[PDB]
Amino acid sequence: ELDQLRQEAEQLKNQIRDARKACADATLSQITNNIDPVGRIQMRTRRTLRGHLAKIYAMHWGTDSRLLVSASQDGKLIIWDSYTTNKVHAIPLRSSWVMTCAYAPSGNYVACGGLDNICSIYNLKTREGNVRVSRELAGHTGYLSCCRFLDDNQIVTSSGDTTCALWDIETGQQTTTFTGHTGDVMSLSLAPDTRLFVSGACDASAKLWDVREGMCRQTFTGHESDINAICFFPNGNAFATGSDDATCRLFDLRADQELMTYSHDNIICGITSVSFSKSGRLLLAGYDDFNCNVWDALKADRAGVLAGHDNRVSCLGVTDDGMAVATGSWDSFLKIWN
Amino acid sequence: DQRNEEKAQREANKKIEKQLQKDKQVYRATHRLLLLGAGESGKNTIVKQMSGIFETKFQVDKVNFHMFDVGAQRDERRKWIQCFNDVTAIIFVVASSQTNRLQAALKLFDSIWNNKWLRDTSVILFLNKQDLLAEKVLAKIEDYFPEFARYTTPEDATPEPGEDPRVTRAKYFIRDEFLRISTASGDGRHYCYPHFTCAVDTENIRRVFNDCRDIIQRMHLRQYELL
């Protein structure tokens, strides 16, 4: 019977390919082409945040659009004031092998985790001035590659187990588990309506996850290798992805097709992080050559370069009001660019 | 009057920075070791005699060593291995002679060695269970590695007096298969430190201390290299 199922899968793959080819009446490059270019985009470092003793694995902007949380190998999370450069908090971790972190949208708590296979939630609104773990989420068996917060006490996590899950931080329980990837899940990005989530993985694919249903609505392909970072286009119907094949791709969720690719002959560096500016016109990407590039998202050209890191770029983030770009790296310094 | 908040923030920053400076002093004095290796290599006997990541703490000559042991994210393994590039050393455990476990160990070794993010990390190599090899050999390498048929020990070999010559050539053959990988690349940016062992004592295991001493000395000398 196995042979029949194999044949059905191949027939369905072709039905999908034809359904997608049917929509190929344009490329983004034939739609945008007469649009004025962004021109040269330049940025300067305005602030440098010093204090980590080791490489930064993760960084995240809060919603007040002023605070940053960053995580590093030496065992600490640091909560920074992006305007004054002062440290607000420094949080010791039980295990130093931290790969990810996230700041709650309410500003009340911080998540982190890594090779310990535990997502630990810290309560910042502490009566003692002592930031303590309020809860630990465990049930994952692989490393935690990414976690993102939802309101109503929920967190979305992804791991090296090839799965993703929705947790209730009241009980320490999973309510929903998302499956279907074959490789490690490398990243999560929440839709603006936080009902759809997108999951990137080491099988060169990305999936659009229906949060309330607990199922995959749509699978996107196009990359040659592992996807390291995904971010949603601000207006909800497209996501940009970056991978180890040293290119970025723009995906169209309504057409179910890649829409545009971003590449250059002189880039053989993997992409470690991607993010969008508020208009969705500037696509930022961090690379293995310790540069970050700024792409013209509609024309696929290079608008500019952010140089000034002495090691691998590990993470990008753009504050919600669009005022600044923060870049974390393996050289242990977190810089704010404007 | 907002100046009162500015004063409070500065004092909070001062307490935090003082604690970070104390931790920096501890961090630099603590060595980090990764325990990595082939399946059924005896990783457990190296750690016994010497939920994710397990950690064992050791002290030798007032220096502190933390070793990260074995389990969790164990097999996949290309994305988490990068977390361990900032270590003093990787301790790679391979048992000396089913599947061709030694060829697998050799491929795993090369995958450390030529990885662009592990290019500066030295490897302490333990060829374990030398007693297993001795019994299998005197009673097996050439079935998987035909080159062994023509192998002789080097003039620099130091066999245990009374040890069977077929075993001594087997031990050195295996060691050399790992070394020929190490000698092919880096140009001296990283080093391999092979040892022959068994689950018998800590005299050879304590060589981790001595290898760390050599690894750190080599790093310190980089600041004094000339243009």
Partner: nanobody
Framework: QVQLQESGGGLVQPGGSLRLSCAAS????????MNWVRQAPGKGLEWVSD????????SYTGSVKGRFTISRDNAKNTLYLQMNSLKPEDTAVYYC?????????????????????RGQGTQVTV
């Protein structure tokens, strides 16, 4: 979607030979290394042969030296394994694994349970 499709397996008597190959699709690989991987009945997966993207062979497992050879043709996106005189021990499923990244020297883990499916595969019985 990246694809690697194997063909050319079947039954050969001891002392005979096979030519196995994979057609690659969905990618540019002139930038990538290729690996032949084998799974004997009752065993896990073992590495057999490794060719660089330049066309130069790098290595063979010792047990196949002088018996198996490999080659590639970047003009047609194909990978080949020539299996000369075979023994009963060579009965296995053959796979065309590829390395995870372009322009590199490291390559792992091409024999793992969930990686090594790339290029899955064909049965050769001696």
């Amino acid at each position: 979607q990246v694809q690697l499709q194997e063909s050319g397996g079947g039954l050969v008597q001891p002392g005979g030979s096979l030519r196995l190959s994979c057609a690659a699709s969905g990618f540019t690989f002139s930038n990538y290394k290729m690996n032949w991987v084998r799974q004997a009945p009752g065993k896990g997966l073992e590495w057999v042969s490794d060719i660089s993207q330049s066309g130069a062979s790098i290595s063979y497992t010792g047990s196949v030296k002088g018996r198996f050879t490999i080659s590639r043709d970047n003009a047609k996106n194909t990978l080949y394994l020539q299996m000369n005189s075979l023994k009963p021990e060579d009965t296995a499923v053959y796979y065309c694994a590829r390395c995870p990244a372009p322009f590199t020297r490291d390559c792992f883990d091409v024999t793992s349970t969930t990686y090594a499916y790339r290029g899955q595969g064909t049965q050769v019985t001696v």
